[PDB]
Structure formats: structure tokens, C-alpha cells
């Protein structure tokens, strides 16, 4: 289930980095799959079996435990693709590249950063990245917030919780 500019992030929203797009959850929600977000479970119990306890991690019965989904490894308390187990990126994260039959772990970088081909394609080179998100909601546009691109309020507008739409002048 690839993530593109037309993906619907249920209970989440799209973000864009130097070389990929993904869904980021709202509030305290965690990823169940690549484009759905649900409430997490703090303490895995017998009632919590098969319920999400983190990003790409469900509670399973040994008995209670929070294990990563198939194809994910728990590296630094975060479930990441197994191909990324040994890939450190610096100013970015490791993503699963499927452009070739043999998959690889490659770095995707914060806005302003690009894979430095002289540094194992780690995020140690300054480079441009044009936003491609479709910010179609009212008074919204693509902005660089905390290293990632996202649809946010245009300058002079804030989200009011009485309507959840960017408001101002």
C-alpha cells in the first residue's frame, strides 16, 4: 500500500520528506497500517490482544507483549522496516525502497537535506526539495514544519476548534 499525494490518512495527515510521502497520525494515535491511525493501548493485557500498542505494533499473547508487525523490527523502541535495522540517516529516516526486485534501506531526509552520495546517502548534504502535496482545504498551503512538508494554515490564519478550519486574515 504505497503512499502518494492522493492517499487518505484515516485519523492522520500526509507529510513529505526529501524522497517520499507518508501518513502522520493526529494527537496520540498510532499507525495500524501505512495509512490508518487508531488509539494505542498502554498496557497490553488479555483484553488488548491484537489491538495496536504503537506504530506498526499490536499486542500479542505469548503472555501479554507488544511486538512489531511482520516485516518490522523494534529498533530504539520504534518499529521500523527490517531492511532499515542497520541504516542510520541523521537528518532523516530510513524508508523501504522497492524500485528494484531486491529491496534496500535508503535514507529520506528533512526538507532542506538530501542523501549525500559521498556519505552512504545519509542526510548530510544541503539540497532543495519542492513540495508536491495537494493542499486543497480552505486557506491552507504547503509549509515546512519541523523538518517535513505538510498542509498548514496560510500566514495570518490559525485553526479554531469551533470549525477546525484555518481562520484569520
Amino acid at each position, epitope marked *: 500500500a504505497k503512499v502518494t499525494v492522493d492517499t487518505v490518512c484515516k485519523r492522520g495527515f500526509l507529510i513529505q520528506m526529501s524522497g517520499h510521502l507518508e501518513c502522520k497520525c493526529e494527537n496520540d494515535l498510532v499507525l495500524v497500517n501505512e495509512e490508518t491511525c487508531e488509539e494505542k493501548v498502554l498496557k497490553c493485557d488479555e483484553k488488548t490482544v491484537n489491538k495496536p500498542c504503537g506504530d506498526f505494533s499490536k499486542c500479542i499473547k505469548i503472555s501479554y507483549a507488544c511486538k512489531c508487525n511482520l516485516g518490522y523490527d523494534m529498533v530504539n523502541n520504534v518499529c521500523i522496516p*527490517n531492511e532499515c*535495522k*542497520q541504516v542510520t540517516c541523521g537528518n532523516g529516516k530510513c524508508i523501504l525502497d522497492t524500485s528494484n526486485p531486491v*529491496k*534496500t534501506g*535508503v535514507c529520506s531526509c528533512n526538507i532542506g537535506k538530501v542523501p549525500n*552520495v*559521498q556519505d552512504q*546517502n545519509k542526510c548530510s548534504k544541503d539540497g532543495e526539495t519542492k513540495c508536491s502535496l495537494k493542499c486543497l482545504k480552505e486557506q491552507e498551503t504547503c509549509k515546512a514544519v519541523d523538518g517535513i512538508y505538510k498542509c498548514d494554515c496560510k500566514d495570518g490564519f490559525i485553526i479554531d476548534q469551533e470549525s477546525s478550519i484555518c481562520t484569520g486574515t
Partner: antibody
Amino acid sequence: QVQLVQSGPEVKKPGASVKVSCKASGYTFTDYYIHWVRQAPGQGLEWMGWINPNSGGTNYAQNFQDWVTMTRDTSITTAYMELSSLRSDDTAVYYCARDRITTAAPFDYWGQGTLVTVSS
Amino acid sequence: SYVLTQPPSVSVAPGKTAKITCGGNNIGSKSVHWYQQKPGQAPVLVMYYDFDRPSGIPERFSGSNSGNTATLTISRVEAEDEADYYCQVWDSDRYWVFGGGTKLTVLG
């Protein structure tokens, strides 16, 4: 189709040098390392080093740099491995291989290997 | 240098399960790649990032990696699986490492 085609077998005297080529095709040359792996007859695989086709940079395995020079020609997408001051013990099959420029990517494509035979 | 230790030889009966091990200090933290090499041929990737199976490799091949031992498991071994098998990890001190290799002999 990704292909790594090496040059043919070589028979050399001690003290000579040989230059083995690795012709790459079917993929973006500058996106993948070119590794060289040594296999003496009856022995195991021995990583010798890589060359970065982009910057031309090299990363030699411990002490192989004393007699091995890795070069590349982006113009014709060929990497080269030059063995200097050959000794009979250098007899081996030499392979080239590629992996995506990143951390710990697998060697998904290998050349057919070149047998270098060194004998007085 | 980082040391990968493989058994020099493994023997199994046809149709039985074979297990090739690759020892290393906390090898669970490294992505292990496995290469099969038959006589006269270049090595061939048969398992990568511990358990990803390349397209074209039989489902009898499975990979695992936990603690201090990465394992290549070949269930229902056929005679064509008789070859040398090499594991491979990257060490963050900037060098690749091949294991010693395991000769797989199919009895019968």
C-alpha cells in the same frame, strides 16, 4: 537488464601487473557501489573494497591497498581493479559486484569473475 | 575486526531440513545477507536483511537472525541445494565481512 560483465582470464608472471575491468549496464551506474571480492582456489569469499562511481572515492579492506588500485570510468560505466607486483599467492578468481549506495545493502548482482593466474 | 563464524560443513538427508548458522557478537543488530555459490559459478544472493527472500528463490529457504546467531533454514532439502553458503554483514567501522562459508552436502 542489470549486467556486470568482467574481462577474460589472465596469466601473469610474478612482479607483473594486471588490470581487470567490470562492464556495468542496465542500471544507473552512479547509484551503486562496485565491490571487488577475492576467492583463492578452494577458499572463501574475501571482500577487497569498493569504489564510489560518483566521487571516485575508494574504501579498501585492511592492507589490500598496498597492491590493489580501484578506478572507474563513468564515461563507459566500467570499474577497474589493478593488481600490482603480483605474487603467485595472488592467484584467485576476482569478482565485481554492486549494491545500492547506502548502509548495508546486499550485493544483488555479481560479475562472472576473472581468474588471475600468477606463475613463474 | 568483526568475526563471522560458520560451520565448515553441514550434511542433511534429501527431504529433511538443513540449518546453516552464522555466529557473531550481537549479530541480531546487523542485517545478515546470504549467498549461495555452486561450483564454477559466481555467488548468488538467496537471503537479505535477515529474512527477505529474493524473487526466484524457493520458499523452502527461510532466514532468521536473533541474539548471536543468524540462521539460513532450507526445509525439504533437494540435491540441487548442494553448494557453498556465505553469510555477510556490514560493520559500521566501514568494511564488509563474509563468513568462512558452509559446504552443504545432500546425502543419499
